[PDB]
Amino acid sequence: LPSLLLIDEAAAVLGRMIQGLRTGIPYIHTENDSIKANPILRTALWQAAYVLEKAYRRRYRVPWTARRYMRELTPRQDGRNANREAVMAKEFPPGAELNSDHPVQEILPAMIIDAEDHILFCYLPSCVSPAIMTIIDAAVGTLATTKDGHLQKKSRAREGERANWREALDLFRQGACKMTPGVLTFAPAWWPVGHENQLPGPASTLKPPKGEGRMFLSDIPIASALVGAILAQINQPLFESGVKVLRELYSNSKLTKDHSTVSKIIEIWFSPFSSLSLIVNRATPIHRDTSGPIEGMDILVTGGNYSNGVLVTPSFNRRWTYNPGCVVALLGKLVLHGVPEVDGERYCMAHFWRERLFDAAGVPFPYPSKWQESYT
DNA sequence: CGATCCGCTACG
DNA sequence: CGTAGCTGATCG
Ligand SMILES: O=C(O)CNC(=O)C(=O)O
Ligand SMILES: [Mn+2]
């Protein structure tokens, strides 16, 4: 699977770039590999290297462990129960480093670690190169302007109507938009709701070989490769495990339904993640994501033509500047996060996990990494 | 109990 | 695309 070898090389080269920034010995990339063959990607790796190098120098600590926090949470605790969330806010407060009457919105790259150094949240503003943002802009635009596509049809079909908060009508930007608002999710293999005691199969959005879902995957391999390499700098065990899981699902036809389609999708899946969701022109209320493993680190990428983006993390007493090209890695099942409506058009690519694909592939799901792992 | 959960299936 | 069916665990 050359796609996975490509993202492995991107991850390894990004690690060498970062190491070289930290030691003062500039890394000299010499191999005739996929990074030499994709200079746009190489340059974007350099830009990410500089942002990650800054984030590692700016670590706030909370006075509790992720372990205790996750023990207190119930399996589907997403933030909608105010009494429970008051219990969490009192039991697990921001601490002295973060509490502050009226703190300023953050702009420098940074991270939040727990009392035993596990990374909970990694903030990478201006991480994605303009060239790759243009590529993503075009891929999302193609998806969100398709005349009879999911977003347009789902728009019109429920514009006759003018619980499931992720597609709630009032969260979508109203009026004329270049990009029809909506949500589409993609996965090489996953389970139907309430149906996990069976083999996973391809997401319905990706099953047509020439439908728009597969075409969207085809437009973004350079971006997915960048995102995967960033993940590898933050939690290398999780990156390597995700890649191993995809290789196993590719190799063993007994693990999925419709394995031939799963294999053709994996061949264009340039990512370590289990799943990718595209959220177009939608505000995001404060929430936790409950369907993945709490040990899983999700990655958010935000884009578009807007200028006042803010990502809110109330448990950290922080607001973060969240403008196009910003990347946020976070334990989304622990960390409450939200993104208010913005004055312009926006999309988000959210990368996340399905733990039982790890079980099915015989690959342990690793516990969240510590910051010192960056310096080994 | 009913409602909910980043959903698939066969049909129209 | 939508609709109804289907699953099992959580949550109120
Ligand atoms: O909208 C954003 O930028 C962030 N999105 C999410 O956290 C989500 O949809 O789960
Ligand atoms: Mn989320």
Author numbering: 17 to 178, 202 to 415
Q: What text appears in the publication on this structure?
A:
We recently identified an atypical bifunctional dioxygenase CcTet from Coprinopsis cinerea that works on both 5mC and 6mA demethylation. We recently demonstrated that CcTet, which was previously identified as a C. cinerea 5mC dioxygenase, also functions as a dsDNA 6mA demethylase. Its catalysis not only of conventional 5mC oxidation during the DNA active demethylation process, but also of dsDNA 6mA demethylation makes it a bifunctional dsDNA demethylase. In complex with dsDNA, the middle of the enzyme contained two anti-parallel β-sheet layers comprising 12 β-strands total, with one sheet containing β6-β11-β8-β9 and the other containing β4-β5-β12-β7-β10-β3-β2-β1. These sheets formed a jelly-roll catalytic pocket to accommodate cofactors and substrates.
The resolved structure suggested that there were four CcTet–5mC-dsDNA complexes in each asymmetric unit. Loop1 and loop3 inserted into the dsDNA minor groove, whereas the α′/loop′ region bound to the edges of the dsDNA strands near the major groove. Unexpectedly, the dsDNA strands in the CcTet–5mC-dsDNA complex were rotated ∼5° anticlockwise due to compression by the loop1 and α′/loop′ regions; this indicated an alternative mode of 5mC-dsDNA binding compared to 6mA-dsDNA. Instead, Arg92 and Arg96 formed salt bridge interactions with the O2 atoms of dT4 and dC5, or with the backbone phosphate of dC5, pushing the dsDNA strands outward by ∼3.6 Å compared to the 6mA-dsDNA bound form. Specifically, in the CcTet–5mC-dsDNA complex, the finger residue Val232 was stacked between dC5 and dG7 through hydrophobic interactions; the stacked residue then pushed the 5mC base, causing it to flip into the active pocket for subsequent catalysis. The cofactors Mn2+ and NOG and the flipped 5mC substrate were stabilized in the correct positions and orientations inside the active pocket through multiple hydrophobic and hydrophilic interactions. Mn2+ was primarily stabilized via octahedral coordinate interactions with the side chains of His326, His376 and Asp328, a water molecule, and the NOG C5-carboxyl and C4-ketone groups. In contrast, the Asp337 side chain rotated ∼90° in complex with 5mC-dsDNA to form two indirect hydrophilic interactions (through two water molecules) with the N4 atom of the 5mC pyrimidine ring, further stabilizing the 5mC base inside the active pocket.
